Amino acid sequence: ISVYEDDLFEKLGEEIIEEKLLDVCFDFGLEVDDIEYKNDKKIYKIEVPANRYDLICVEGLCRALKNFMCKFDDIKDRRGYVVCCVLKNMNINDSVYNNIIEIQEKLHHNLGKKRSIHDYDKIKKINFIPLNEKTNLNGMNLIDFYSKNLNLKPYLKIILSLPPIINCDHTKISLNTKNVFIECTAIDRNKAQIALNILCSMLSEYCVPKYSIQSFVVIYENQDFSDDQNLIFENKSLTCNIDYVRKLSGISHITVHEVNNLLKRMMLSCDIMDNNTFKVTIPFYRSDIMHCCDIIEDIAIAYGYGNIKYEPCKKHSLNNCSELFRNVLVECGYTEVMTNALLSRDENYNCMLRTHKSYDDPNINLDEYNPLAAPIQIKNSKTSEYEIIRTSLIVNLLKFVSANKHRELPLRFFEIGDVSYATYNQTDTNAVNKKYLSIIFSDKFTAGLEELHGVLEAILKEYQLFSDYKIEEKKKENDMYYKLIPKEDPSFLNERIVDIVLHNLKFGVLGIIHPKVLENFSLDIPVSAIEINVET
Amino acid sequence: PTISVYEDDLFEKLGEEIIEEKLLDVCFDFGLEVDDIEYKNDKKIYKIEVPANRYDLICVEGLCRALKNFMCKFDDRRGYVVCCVLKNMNINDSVYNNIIEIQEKLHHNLGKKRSVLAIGIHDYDKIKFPLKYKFEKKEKINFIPLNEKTNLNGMNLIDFYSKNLNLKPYLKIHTKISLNTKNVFIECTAIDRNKAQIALNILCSMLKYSIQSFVVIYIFENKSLTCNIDYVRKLSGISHITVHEVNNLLKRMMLSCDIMDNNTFKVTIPFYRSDIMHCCDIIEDIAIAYGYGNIKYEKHSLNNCSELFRNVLVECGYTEVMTNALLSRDENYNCMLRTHKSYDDPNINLDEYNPLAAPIQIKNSKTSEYEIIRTSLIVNLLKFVSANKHRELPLRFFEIGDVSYATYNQTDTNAVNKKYLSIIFSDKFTAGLEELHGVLEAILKEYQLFSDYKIEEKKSDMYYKLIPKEDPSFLNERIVDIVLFPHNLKFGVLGIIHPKVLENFSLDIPVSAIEINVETLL
Amino acid sequence: INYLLLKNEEYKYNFFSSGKKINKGNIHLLTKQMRTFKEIFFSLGFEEMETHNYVESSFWCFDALYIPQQHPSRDLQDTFFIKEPETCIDKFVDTEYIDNIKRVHTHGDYGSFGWNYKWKLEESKKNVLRTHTTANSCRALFKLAKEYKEAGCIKPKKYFSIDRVFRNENLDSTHLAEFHQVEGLIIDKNIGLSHLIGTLAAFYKHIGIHKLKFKPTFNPYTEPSMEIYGYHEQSKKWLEVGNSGIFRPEMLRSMGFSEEVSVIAWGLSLERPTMIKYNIKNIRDLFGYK
Amino acid sequence: NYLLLKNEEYKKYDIFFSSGKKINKGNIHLLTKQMRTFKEIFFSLGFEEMETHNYVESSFWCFDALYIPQQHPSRDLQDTFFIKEPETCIDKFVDTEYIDNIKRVHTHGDYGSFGWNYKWKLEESKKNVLRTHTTANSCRALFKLAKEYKEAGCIKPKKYFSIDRVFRNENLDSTHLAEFHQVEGLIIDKNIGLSHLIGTLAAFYKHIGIHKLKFKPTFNPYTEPSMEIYGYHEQSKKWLEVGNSGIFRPEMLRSMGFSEEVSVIAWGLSLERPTMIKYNIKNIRDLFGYKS
């Protein structure tokens, strides 16, 4: 629907802004991007809603938009007798002619669904040709003229020119005329009065008395459709309760502001004298179901959906998002293994070259997210291997591999679990239990660390974290992710051990264990492994 | 607890004849439990679990008594020691071992290595002189009545002579056992008086239940628990008339007293009870008597538990594919060598298992490929596979979904939508009917571990079988339908497609495939 | 470089990009997003409805949702119509065969107006391919309806649905003929917009933490509706992320629910968020070919 | 066998359908798979997952928060696991909430009837122990509910369930190990009793495969009305405890300020043994850990 930019600022008589006009419309029900200009007039087009016919024309639309932002006010089966009535005199121009043609092009095809004169100048089988052509045809032989192009063929029929194919044979005033008597016929006698009242005040903006109609309506009050023409504006009312709307709109306790909103949206409420009732008067310019739903829709538009006060089923879970890791891990041929509960002291301290504890851990509250030292010990039990809880579970994993020395060459395993260490500070129970995961590869002959790298990046690819360098490459090809920094830890083989980093928070390690440890664990074949947090 | 129960002689003590197989039932209905129990060569005996909540069941006497009554039958602050004796009594071996058992139970069971626990029994046939002992440590010592001592003097440093079975020391950590006596006495040490009377009163009830008094140098007290009736009514889930309560408490040795606002009773708890303060237990006992079983007390899943296969499937390098919505008719009829349909199905589709075809067409659709909905997913997959024949060598895909057909009866709208899945292999060289077989077998090893082979090896009910069949789209003698029930309901197929269709679908490399319903699985 | 021969006789770095990817087997992305959504939905405390059918008659599809048949949806330029089982039979012959709805179509209930329309049955009986998953949803509502009367209580229920849906707009590069829509609906007595606003805030917070803004629209299923858009800096610095609306007591109380019952619903695409998520620019690769 | 476009019938013969390919697969642990199934069924019933994010637990929560006497064989060693490394914990709501009420209860009566008679010292109750009863974590979630109960919610019947590994060490048992994994369920609402417990066990143990057929009384300290439950699969005409249940005791219960009309029900059982049952396995010393 063409804006005709200056036509707006004229019909409204205001000057504010471009973005504060698209702004107001956006705060109203219509909004459109993809709106272009012709030559020297920059225009736009907008998808008016098909709930009400009052916004079809730029005239009614601009008028309602005026009323909106606190500016404007209101104005003041064989069918028997189809109605085609208008007033006597009016006035036309081009800038209104182009617009009057628009309803004829939209109102008929769009709303009329293949559409199931207006001259009053020189006014009260085959005779002549409608407008442009000069031909006749006595019966029905006419489809031969032009039927494939944009014609009436696509609205032929279903089982005084014609309703669906306007022809204007006898009369027509002019494109540049002064008297007008609009006509239209329809399928049945209900929408008739509607369409007449709409055309009526639709264009009464272009009339000599500025929305005033002769029609000499001041005699009777009853049309028998027999003597009235052969020898219109009816409104309705919808009562509305207030607690209903208060509940719906989520902002309540006022009842006069309802009247103010309904004034500002061209409604004219009526204040059903109780504190909790209205009798709002719906005119013809609305075709919205009488139920107060749409009434509250207007009240809410006017209050502005944004300005409802209220705001308050939580994060609640991580171990549901661990199954992600689990699935992605077993997708890579990795099998799950459940380690033993606890490990020998020397199994995690003396076998691996471990000095464990820095309890104080200079940071006052150690590290919420961080790898594990400062282990949690145990009181002696009847068992011979239940001396301490895990601190890095991989060792038990390693122990497991010392158990099955005949299986397939590439042994690929992993594990999620809870581990525990000692905590001095505000940590309850003076001890902490955090979840980690470690994974390991081994082949009878060669190594890992090529695979393990692919595995790591693949796990981290469903989360976007990328190796400090892949993001570069992509930048080189078109953040808030990790990086692997080589470090030095005795348990792993030199030049083949790397810590991981994010916020400079180390949480994982990746390495080739030193052969001495393999000697410790009665192993023969080289293994590689990684140990990473998740809570991080 | 432990299994210290004893011989069959109870059947006499009860004086009844209810065979075994009719007794272990009652114990199971009581709270008592016994595993396989052995015989002492000529005496058929058993052993019992016996909870340590009540001391009433600790001994064979109290146990047999409770079972009888059960069914419908009838200055150093010295630890205050108490010492009671009887008038007349009598023992025998079958009772000697039992009194020793109680002396071993009150000590082992109730004693936590016997800190406030000990048993000082003897006979009242030695002396009767009144005396007092509470003092400072000592003044002198000569001897003591223990079995492994017979000299008492000469070499072993005094105040300390430590040699016994396991817990020999007690300080820093005989004369006669009175076997077959008539008068009997007993001494015992406790922390203080409440637990003293508690631990002591139990020996009193041993046998016709009469015992001389105890010398009181400076006793059996009962207690009471009030209980409301709606309380128990709500808890036990019944609507008792409360006279049944007096009957139940009679049968479990509970002499209630019936203080009745119509909504209250009051029970008289003795010491020989699994004592616990809140009168909760009371309902525990009323429920034991009423019988847990006899209380008046008084669903499927598809899209959530289907992903099992999906998970199991994406293992082993299989990737998932999302089909296109619908496919042209000739795409399912002319491209494929089948072309068939059971329009007036009435016989056919007598049951909507069995992945079949009876498709539903569509008006006002796209005139390119949008004429009918799927009936077997492979085609759309093939369409996808006809699009990327340039990728890495082994192409393996799969898809689960929902499909649809027309249905005469059985649906409000005369149409059905059931979900199944298809899988596809291609390696440019072979098919994967070997791989695919392993796959199918592994999935049904993921729900049943049973196709047909290796039988239902001894190291078996409601499982499947692959029946070779003949359908045109696939290559002869290399196509099998699949079926599982005692109703011969086929739901899956596995086959190598016939090459002519590949000529139709601009395919180039050999493929193998499987297609099985799931909605049927159950 | 790589160490082996770890026997005692041991006589003695490009952390740049990666190591050789070997066979990798993964799941469809849309299925992963569907998973994540199920997680968060059940986390809020929702119940999955059963939309396991996409054939639903026009009746459940359209007239049950109080929409006159004569509208741009019914036209073939925006829908897909089946002809094979074109007629259905099992409909609740009660409430004059839901002739209540026709009446509501033609005349008034709950004080509202219809259209002064005949609202014939046949168009309701024409079998259609679902264009709004909500159709299936609304069915599961009516059962609750009976339950509510069979019990008289008020039990606020939370529901959500996801399954394939279909439309036929064109074949121009706009959006495709089939797609997937997640949908949520809550039901209880005397609840209004504020709850809807808040719950959208929380939900679309789980998708990202974005202050939201919504503009009114006009739609027949929800008389009071709005289009929701929240901010994750896309092009206009936000995205028209979702659709919404509030209930329609007109048809609602004609299902026997209650005078005080209100429900709220909202629906959106599953693909379009995916397109946004995994760094995608147009919908031709997530679906079908890769 | 096919690579032929033109050459259709150069056939060798279209030649045995009893076998499997049997190549590298990659699998999930059985026990976590069982865990999966259980979470499925629980969320099907309408439950809420608790948070057992702890592996060690003070004795108070372990024993004394419940009516469990300190002087007991459980507290005795050789049958439990004691940490003793950080043997000290601090901070429990002494303030008219938990600690002094419980101390009273082991030495006197409150919140219902009266009576436990014991020197309820605090320190030994404060010694940190390794879990023998998972319910500990459970009980925490109660007290917070407690406060919720007081604020505005009068009756919101809540359903909870918890599972994570627990451990004990008798010496080395010929049947059981250090308690791989333990399931526990808890329902709480006004005025709830046996009938509800029996019904819900019937429902659950029906969903697992069996049909609860017999329940026998047992003796238990935290739940006074307790029982050992049995449902029937073809094992023997004898049996073994197929899990336990029971409902709690106002002794510990009303000490969190719960209403007088408030009653709760609980049940727990093992996770390994049912698995042993499912996949036809014996002697789970290879199913778990090594040789898996």
Ligand SMILES: COc1ccc(NC(=O)N2CCCCN3[C@H](CN(C)C)[C@H](c4ccc(C#Cc5ccccc5)cc4)[C@@H]3C2)cc1
């Ligand atoms: C942050 O991630 C996201 C996530 C999503 C998006 N985009 C969308 O959210 N889209 C794409 C934009 C335009 C196309 N829309 C289609 C039609 N639509 C213009 C009206 C379609 C669509 C259709 C219907 C509904 C509905 C509904 C409904 C349900 C119950 C009651 C009331 C109404 C929703 C979407 C998409 C939406 C972006 C980023």
Ligand SMILES: COc1ccc(NC(=O)N2CCCCN3[C@H](CN(C)C)[C@H](c4ccc(C#Cc5ccccc5)cc4)[C@@H]3C2)cc1
């Ligand atoms: C159909 O599938 C099944 C399923 C299970 C089984 N077997 C078991 O169910 N077992 C194994 C038998 C013996 C070992 N038990 C242990 C100790 N126990 C003798 C007392 C252990 C155990 C310990 C404690 C509880 C408890 C509790 C509870 C919680 C709250 C309130 C009240 C009580 C339960 C089990 C197992 C049980 C068989 C098939």
Ligand SMILES: [Mg+2]
């Ligand atoms: Mg509206």
